[PDB]
């Protein structure tokens, strides 16, 4: 075999880069930021029809402030959560206020390549940190298993990626209202997911400075599903 | 926890214009007992720093092996070991400043009483004071042992603040110095008459005075003193 | 047996005023009935408008000041230089000195600056960690003589209104920078002539809006 | 590094099967097979030595049965010196318990944790599994009398009559076949022997080449017996049962 | 080929794969620039993003008052590097009260990138930099590269299509190191370097990055509209 | 210490220590879990190549974690006893720190996670375990049934079935079982459960193994006579 | 310190003084001897005011994790546990807390659990703390009806506070007052003896040991 | 913690431990449970260090409660006591040893037989008639000794413990505010609610 922190001949980690093609074989994740707040959403993608959706959590919080989607092995996310947590928390307690969300990102992808012959192989998950604080406002981040994350306006991970992403190059403008991008993450969802987009196989998400980070409920996605198809057919 | 064997006394210091001042008898004592004769206190580093060590001499003398080695870890890698990037007066103290500390807060210190004496390279003069405990402090005398209650009294006549070091010269200083050791010579049990005295100036460097002797002494009113009080003969 | 802790003497004062807040410390350092230093500043500015003095065992004083100003470096490096706030850097003093808890740092610690909303700001703690914000407060070896003192000219405390029959307080309101000044100096006259580690001379940092300034007067040498 | 000689003792196939594991049970099945039968009055464990030689001494030998405590004992198909690693790791534990709540090990407790110990070896630590399958044979009060057995793989598996090592195919269906409830421990010794003079690779069963032993309640009121039969009395059993 | 599945195995011809294939990110990595007078030193460096909606990664960290670094490879790496020196930096400051020299600094990371070239399990780091600094001895600039070797330079570049900048500090060697008590001039020629290494893109506000250390100036880092001055 | 990452990604984005592990849950004998108005039932496939077993003693295919908890499982038998020692420990450091019982979801979070751990931890190879989780929260009547994977992956399922031909029975599932109107009583949960399985088992003598679980600690395993009285019902009805 | 908190019909009473004593050097008359945990549940503190500050928060920020992880505002009984456990493991070492961690939750309802620095963990519907303990004890319990309206028992926490501030040295400064009810906490204000006792003296009667 | 009493009748063993709560000049509370229930026919009352008490008995009652568990099956009290003794045994020599003294009441239904083990913090197990820890034997154990016999009923028995309590209440310094009393039998555990 071969070592697990080994070079190829192009200078890239052999192990980062197959992590890699794991998370494009994820469910996707879309998330949007604007100025009246950052929107998340994931497909859930359940495996059968017996499986309870409501129990699929790719969707998390992370503190009041800070929210997290993700894609690829979901179950590699739980300690990377834990820690993102904890590292939240913890600075409350040694500092009385809020963490930046670049900070928490930076600490969570810290953990990312500590990883050889610490931990025997990379994530083989991708995560999006959205979050809010006084210094730079409104933020997203993409969070990637190589120990790289970079801000983004708009950004979309997993198996309809590349697809996606090219949508929302079209569709961002700075003066983005909260609700114009919350159909926008629906309507693009809608577009790269194999099933019929509702609100059983779809979640949304947001974080505002007001109401802090919050999950949508079914009944209230289920409306700007009806909202978003009722636009569409109106021109 | 340690209890001190062989110690040394006093070690005195002051600042003048151009420079500073130190000194400390070759004294090691062992308990009352006037053991070692021949022991020097004042340990040069570079050509620009002084250390005087008071207390314990086996753990001057580790303190010796300490600076001795400073001095060859700086040289390593360094092309300008003997100009820009020699060793400062204020590198020096630092680094034992921490390592008095650090052995106090493992309850084991370094049984002494050290003043770092020296010129900085842009001609300031440097004077500081650190213990067994850690404590560091600085001003324009300093001494330790006896000479605290002493010396510095006698030393503080000449200056007395900030100001008073430019109208103080070396001349002026070093007699105000051997002065100083000449009543801890009559009033500390555990001094002796023979002594080490070095200047740092920042014109004319580094001047190490060896076997120095406290004279000119006052004894001869004690041929009148008969009895303790009421006896005639 | 060795003893690892002494006591260096000396005393500390903080007031705080609507825009402004000033840390005072005498400069004399002594050890039983000697004087050490004359002039030995335990009154430091610490970067982002935050001054601090940590009065007691100097070797522990200093440690400590020395641990503050460096963990302001590392949460700039670790935090996109963000300023650090009064009330955090007080939170972060308090687990530096509850991390030895069970051999403790030697000292009352006093911090100055201004909260977010720009008023003044003083901070006082323990020598294990425990803090509170406060308009007021004295530390150190005269700190039983200058704190009542401090009660009754900045809080107005036991003073009502003439002819109201005791029944209204005298009521409260800002200090300016004179003013505050003025019961500095004051505070420390009166300390310097009743307690005999306390004198040499009196070094007083103010903190604006603008930064930090230096007030240095002379004190009773005896 | 070292990597290069790593055989990768604790990896799956890709059908999902443990290499070691499987070649260990492969080895188990050349070693001398050992029968277990299970009555309503006791227990037998009858197994066959590996071809012996004339000049064996064969009365001051061990190399099957092995003593637990008091009310278990082991009959073993693999390698012995494995054996022995876990046999005196088993012993241990049946001390420790006794020490603790000062009463005898439950059978299945034992051979649990036996069974436990091998498991590790198939998943972490690197090293080869031990390659050893046991026939535990006990008495406790809660469940009376109870044969086991447990393999490399740290599976095991409660019985009525069972047989380990070489031939267990032909030795199972012949056990499944003459195998009644009600059956009494002079039935037990008679099927035990009986099947192994079937399944046998040698030419004819001799006392020489074989170790038996009982757990009965045939001591007086209420308590259990281990015999382990000594080789005149082997001789005599293989006499009364007209093998010989 | 059989020779470079770990840093411990030399080739035939006595070359360490692995550490070569480390050199090989650097190349892939965005151009940044380093050059320095009597006075100052400067960094300039070209930040790259993923796509428009991305931001532009940072290629420069500041190490000490006196001291900092530009980065070019795998960024996690530069972190880790970077941390280290500011530990360094930091203990020499705590212990000594002395400012780490920029010589040291250097080798100190040469060291400890060795270490790493020498054992099994461990790789090489996977990133080159380009430290600046003014010590007692003024100005400096240093490049380390992760095979170890550390070098020091009056100018210098490392990235992609970094040639074409290395090539006209070569030239302008004269010109720029007597660039004394002028920031704007020094950060010009460093600006005029870098664009040697351009291809189909320009600098832009949210593009360029410039940081500057020296005489009577701290360690600082420009970028957004404080860089326009320079387009 | 047995450093080796056994646990690594192939350049696809695989990886086949997981997913060989998977295989071995597919070689493990059939179990499903059902879940009802009021109660969960789990069944249990027990092959009959095994005769002169002695079933008194025989460790039981589905395992008390709690008095209000059960786990089943499909795969390497010796793996799944650590995970269930594990959670039973776990279970009871639960009551102790927060004098409250776990929920079936906690309980299954912490399984889960071990299996996670073992993923992408040096010297260790995952578990070729797939469990299914039942029984109902402290103080609730709503039911729960989880099932967790060597992944490390875990979710609610009103029915599901793991094991080998559990894609058979999970087809059975799929169309016998309404949302909208779940087994309202016992005897209606454990004849799904008992006819899923009868599509894949052979015969419904001692191969069958069912255990309910009712709220408030209510845990009971049925003998074979009373499953074979639902095997008998089921045949007659199906004679049509 | 004084502190106490009761169970009553309407909920749980929490009031405490706000002195700082070292020896007998009056430190301060204005600290915070309540903390606020989450908005249904309150910790006391009495003893080492660095211990009980410290390890508090510390409290808070578990209880913050408990509720990211399980989705759920933790229990009294388990936030209690979780510092009593804490403090166990320091037994010996010379913690010095006396704290009562109160609060409401739907499976509990009303609750109220005193912890010490040696590891003894009580639930209880009556608990006063701190070196004047006794003095508000003997005013509280003298006083207390479960049938109490929260005006009434808003006013025999205070005025038991009042009792011990008078009484013991080590206590006064001024009362601080809260509320537990179904719905959270509500805090009831800053109430100066300096002002308090003459108030109380004059309306009600009492405190005729005192010269008028 | 202070008072705690045990009595084995002919079908029965019978707890009976004290309710007051005392720390300093204050009792903080009068209706405390020193005692866990460590399986279905198997009672441990307890006394000692504040902290140490509690900590050890849910600590002894998680460890049964998971051998319950993984066996499916209850552990007689003679081997649940001899499990206590040795950890206590262990404790001794600890670094900080368990300073909690025990009392175990069980019914051994194998045997259809009321067992008391009495423990000390050292470790020491004995079986008795009827045990005692502290100050309480002092008076206890004499009363016992001329009015117990080894044929009494649970209401006999009951009487007989009315009788210690009333002496302990007579003659003993501090106010211990009563006594929780419970009763272990064939048929499990239950709590005298008027004692
Ligand atoms: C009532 C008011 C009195 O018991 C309460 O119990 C309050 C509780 C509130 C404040 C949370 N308790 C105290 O005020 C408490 C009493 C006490 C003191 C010491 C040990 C245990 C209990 N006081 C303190 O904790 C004070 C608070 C300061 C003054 C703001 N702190 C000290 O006395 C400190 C730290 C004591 C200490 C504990 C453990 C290890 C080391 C030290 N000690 C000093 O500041 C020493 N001294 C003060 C006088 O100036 C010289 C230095
Ligand atoms: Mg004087």
């Given at each position: 075999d071969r070592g697990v922190s080994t070079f190829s001949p192009e200078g890239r980690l052999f192990q980062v880069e197959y992590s890699l093609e794991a998370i494009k074989l994820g469910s996707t994740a879309i998330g949007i930021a604007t100025k009246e707040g950052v929107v998340l959403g994931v497909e859930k993608r359940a495996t059968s029809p017996l499986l309870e959706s409501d129990s699929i959590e790719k969707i998390v919080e992370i503190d009041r402030h800070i929210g997290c989607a993700m894609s690829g092995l979901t179950a590699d996310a739980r300690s990377m959560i834990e820690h993102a947590r904890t590292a939240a928390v913890t600075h409350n307690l040694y500092y009385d206020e809020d963490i930046n969300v670049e900070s928490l990102t930076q600490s969570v992808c810290d953990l990312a390549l500590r990883f050889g012959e610490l931990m025997s192989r990379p994530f083989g998950v991708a995560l999006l940190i959205a979050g809010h604080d006084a210094d730079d406002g409104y933020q997203l981040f993409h969070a990637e298993p190589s120990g790289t994350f970079y801000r983004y306006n708009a950004k979309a991970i997993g198996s309809g990626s590349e697809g996606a992403q090219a949508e929302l190059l079209n569709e961002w403008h700075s003066s983005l209202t909260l609700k114009e991008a919350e159909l926008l993450v629906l309507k693009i969802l809608k577009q790269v997911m194999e099933e019929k987009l509702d609100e059983n196989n779809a979640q949304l998400s947001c974080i505002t400075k007001q109401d802090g980070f919050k999950i949508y409920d079914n009944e209230k996605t289920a409306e700007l599903i009806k909202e978003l198809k009722e636009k569409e057919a109106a021109e | 926890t340690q209890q001190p064997i062989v110690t040394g006394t006093s070690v005195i210091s002051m600042k003048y214009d151009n420079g500073v001042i130190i000194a400390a008898d070759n004294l090691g004592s062992y308990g009352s007992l006037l053991r070692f004769?021949?022991?020097?206190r004042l340990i040069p580093v570079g050509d620009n720093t002084v250390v005087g060590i008071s207390g314990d001499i086996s753990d001057m003398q580790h303190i010796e092996r300490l600076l001795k080695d400073l001095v060859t870890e700086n040289a390593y890698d360094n092309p300008l070991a003997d100009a820009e990037e020699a060793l400062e007066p204020s590198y020096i103290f630092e680094y034992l400043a921490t390592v008095m500390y650090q052995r106090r807060s493992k309850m084991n210190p370094l049984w002494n009483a050290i003043i770092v004496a020296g010129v900085q390279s842009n001609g300031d003069q440097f004077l500081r004071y650190v213990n067994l405990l850690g404590v560091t402090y600085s001003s324009p005398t300093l001494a330790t042992g006896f000479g605290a209650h002493m010396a510095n009294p006698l030393l503080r006549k000449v200056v007395?603040?900030?100001?008073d070091i430019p109208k103080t010269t070396v001349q002026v200083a070093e007699e105000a110095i051997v002065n100083a050791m000449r009543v801890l010579y009559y009033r500390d049990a555990r001094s002796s008459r023979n002594f080490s005295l070095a200047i740092i100036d920042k014109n004319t460097g580094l001047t190490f005075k060896k076997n120095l002797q406290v004279e000119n002494?006052?004894?001869?009113?004690?041929?009148?003193i008969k009895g303790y009080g009421t006896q005639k003969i | 047996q060795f003893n690892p802790y002494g006591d260096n003497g000396g005393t500390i004062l903080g007031i705080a005023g609507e825009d402004f807040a000033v840390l005072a410390g005498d400069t004399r350092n002594i050890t039983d009935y000697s004087i050490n230093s004359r002039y030995e500043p335990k009154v430091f500015d610490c970067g982002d408008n935050i001054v601090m003095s940590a009065n007691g065992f100097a070797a522990d004083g200093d440690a400590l000041v020395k641990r503050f100003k460096n963990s302001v470096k590392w949460y700039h490096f670790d935090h996109n230089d963000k300023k650090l706030s009064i009330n955090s850097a007080a939170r972060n003093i308090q687990h530096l000195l509850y991390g030895k808890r069970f051999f403790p740092y030697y000292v009352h610690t006093i911090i100055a600056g201004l909260d977010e909303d720009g008023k003044g700001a003083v901070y006082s703690f323990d020598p294990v960690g425990s803090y509170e914000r406060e308009q007021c407060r004295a530390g150190g070896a005269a700190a039983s003589l200058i704190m009542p003192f401090l009660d009754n000219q900045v809080n107005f405390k036991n003073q009502y209104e003439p002819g109201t029959n005791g029944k209204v307080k005298k009521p409260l309101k800002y200090l300016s920078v004179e003013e505050v000044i003025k019961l500095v100096r004051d505070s420390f006259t009166s300390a310097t002539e009743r307690h005999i580690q306390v004198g040499d001379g009196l070094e007083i940092l103010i903190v604006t809006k603008d930064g930090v300034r230096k007030e240095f007067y002379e004190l009773k040498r005896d | 590094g070292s990597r290069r000689y790593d055989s990768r003792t604790t990896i799956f196939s890709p059908e999902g099967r443990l290499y070691q594991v499987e070649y260990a049970l492969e080895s188990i099945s050349h070693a001398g097979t050992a029968i277990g039968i299970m009555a309503s009055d006791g227990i037998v464990l009858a197994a066959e030595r590996k071809?012996?030689?004339?000049?064996?001494?064969?009365?001051t030998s061990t190399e099957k049965l092995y003593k637990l405590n008091d009310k278990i004992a082991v009959a073993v198909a693999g390698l012995t010196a494995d054996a022995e690693i876990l046999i005196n790791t088993a012993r241990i534990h049946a001390q420790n318990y006794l020490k603790t709540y000062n009463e005898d090990i439950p059978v299945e407790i034992l051979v649990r944790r036996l069974s436990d110990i091998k498991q590790g070896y198939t998943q972490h630590g690197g090293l080869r599994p031990f390659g050893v399958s046991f026939i535990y044979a006990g008495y406790d009060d809660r469940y009376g009398y109870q044969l086991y057995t447990s393999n490399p793989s740290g599976n095991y598996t409660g019985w009525k009559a069972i047989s380990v090592g070489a031939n267990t195919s032909a030795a199972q269906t012949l056990l499944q076949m003459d195998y009644k409830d009600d059956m009494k421990v002079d039935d037990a010794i008679e099927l035990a022997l009986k099947t192994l003079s079937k399944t046998t690779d040698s030419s004819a069963l001799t006392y020489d080449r074989l170790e038996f032993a009982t757990i009965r309640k045939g001591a007086n009121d209420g308590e259990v017996y281990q015999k382990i039969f000594k080789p005149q009395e082997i001789k005599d059993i293989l006499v009364k049962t007209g093998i010989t | 080929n059989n020779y470079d599945g770990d840093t411990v195995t030399f080739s035939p011809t006595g070359r360490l794969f692995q550490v070569e294939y480390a050199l090989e990110a650097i190349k892939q990595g965005s151009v940044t620039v380093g050059l320095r007078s009597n006075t100052h030193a400067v960094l300039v460096a070209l930040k790259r993003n993923a796509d428009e909606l991305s931001s532009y990664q940072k290629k420069i960290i500041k190490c000490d008052e006196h001291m900092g670094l530009s980065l070019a490879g795998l960024a996690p790496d530069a972190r880790v590097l970077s941390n280290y020196l500011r530990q360094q930096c930091n203990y020499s400051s705590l212990v000594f009260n002395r400012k780490l020299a920029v010589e040291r600094a250097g080798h100190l990371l040469c060291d400890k990138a060795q270490k790493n070239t020498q054992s099994y399990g461990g790789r090489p780091y996977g990133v080159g930099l380009l430290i600046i600094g003014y010590d007692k001895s003024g100005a400096h600039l240093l490049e380390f590269q992760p095979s170890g070797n550390v070098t020091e330079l009056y100018g210098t570049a490392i990235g992609a299509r970094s040639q074409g900048a290395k090539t006209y500090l070569e030239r302008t060697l004269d010109t720029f190191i007597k660039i004394d008590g002028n920031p704007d001039e020094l950060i010009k020629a460093g600006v005029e370097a870098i664009?040697?290494?351009?291809?189909?893109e320009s600098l832009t506000v949210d593009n360029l990055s410039i940081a500057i250390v020296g005489k009577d100036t701290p360690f600082t880092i420009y970028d957004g509209e404080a860089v326009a001055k320079y387009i | 210490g047995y450093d080796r990452a056994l646990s690594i990604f192939s350049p696809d984005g695989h990886i086949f220590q997981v997913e060989y592990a998977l295989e071995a849950v597919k070689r493990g004998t059939c179990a499903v879990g059902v879940k009802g108005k009021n109660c969960v039932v789990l069944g249990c496939e027990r092959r009959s190549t095994l005769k002169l077993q002695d079933t008194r003693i025989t460790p039981s295919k589905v395992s008390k974690i709690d008095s209000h908890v059960v786990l089943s499982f499909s795969g390497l038998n010796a793996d799944s006893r650590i995970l269930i020692e594990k959670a039973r420990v776990e279970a009871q450091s639960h009551r102790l720190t927060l004098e409250d019982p776990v929920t079936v979801e906690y309980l299954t979070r912490y399984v889960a996670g071990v299996q996670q751990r073992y993923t992408q931890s040096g010297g260790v190879r995952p578990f070729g375990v797939s469990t299914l989780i039942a029984g109902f929260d402290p103080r609730d009547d709503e039911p729960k049934l989880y099932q967790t994977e060597p992944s490390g992956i875990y979710s609610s399922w009103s029915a599901q079935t793991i094991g080998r031909n559990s894609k058979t029975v999970r087809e059975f599932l799929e169309k016998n079982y309404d949302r909208k109107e779940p087994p309202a009583t016992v005897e209606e949960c454990v004849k799904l459960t008992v006819r899923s399985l009868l599509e894949v088992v052979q015969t419904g003598a001692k191969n069958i193994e069912i255990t309910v679980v009712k709220p408030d600690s209510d845990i009971v395993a049925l003998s074979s006579e009373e499953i074979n009285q639902y095997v008998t019902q089921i045949e007659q009805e199906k004679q049509e | 310190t004084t502190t106490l908190a009761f169970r009553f019909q309407g909920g749980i009473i929490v009031a405490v003084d706000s002195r700082a004593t070292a020896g007998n050097w009056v430190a301060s008359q204005t600290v915070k001897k309540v903390i606020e945990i989450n908005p249904f549940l309150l910790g006391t503190m009495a003893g080492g005011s660095a211990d009980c500050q410290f390890w508090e928060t510390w409290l808070g920020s578990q209880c913050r994790l408990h509720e990211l992880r399980e989705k759920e505002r933790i229990s009294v009984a388990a936030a209690s546990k979780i510092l009593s456990n804490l403090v166990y493991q320091y037994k010996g070492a010379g913690l010095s807390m006396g704290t009562m961690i109160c609060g409401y939750t739907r499976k509990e309802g009303p609750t109220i659990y005193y912890v010490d620095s040696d590891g003894t963990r009580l639930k209880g519907d009556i608990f006063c703390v701190g070196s004047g303990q006794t003095f508000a004890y003997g005013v509280l319990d003298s006083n207390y009806k479960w049938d109490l309206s929260v005006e009434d028992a808003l006013y025999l926490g205070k005025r038991s506070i009042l009792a011990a501030a008078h009484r013991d040295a080590y206590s006064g400064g001024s009362v601080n007052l809260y509320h537990v009810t179904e719905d959270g906490w509500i805090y009831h204000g800053n109430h100066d003896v300096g002002e308090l006792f003459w108030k109380v003296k004059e309306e009600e009667g009492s405190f005729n040991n005192v010269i008028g | 913690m202070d008072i705690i009493l045990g009595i084995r009748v002919q079908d029965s063993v019978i707890l009976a431990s004290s309710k007051a709560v005392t720390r300093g000049i204050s009792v903080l509370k009068d209706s405390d449970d020193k005692t866990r229930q460590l399986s279905p026919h198997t009672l441990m009352s307890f006394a000692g260090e504040a902290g140490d008490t509690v900590q050890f008995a849910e600590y002894i009652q998680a460890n049964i409660q998971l051998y319950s568990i993984r066996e499916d099956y209850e552990l007689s009290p003679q081997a649940v006591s001899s499990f206590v003794r040795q950890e206590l045994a262990k404790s001794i020599?600890?670094?900080?040893?368990?300073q909690v003294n025990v009392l175990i009441g069980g019914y051994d239904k194998k045997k259809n037989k009321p067992e008391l083990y009495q423990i000390d913090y050292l470790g020491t197990k004995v079986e008795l008639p009827y045990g005692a820890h502290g100050y309480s034997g002092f008076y206890t154990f004499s009363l016992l000794d001329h009015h117990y016999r080894p044929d009494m009923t649970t209401e006999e028995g009951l009487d007989l413990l009315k009788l210690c309590v009333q002496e302990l209440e007579k003659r003993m310094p501090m106010d211990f505010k009563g006594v929780i009393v419970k009763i272990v039998d064939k048929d499990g555990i239950r709590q005298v609610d008027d004692f």
């Open positions: - | 004769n021949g022991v020097e007395d603040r900030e100001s002494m006052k004894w001869d009113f004690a041929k009148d | - | 071809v012996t030689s004339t000049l064996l001494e064969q009365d | 664009s040697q290494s351009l291809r189909d | - | - | 020599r600890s670094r900080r040893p368990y």
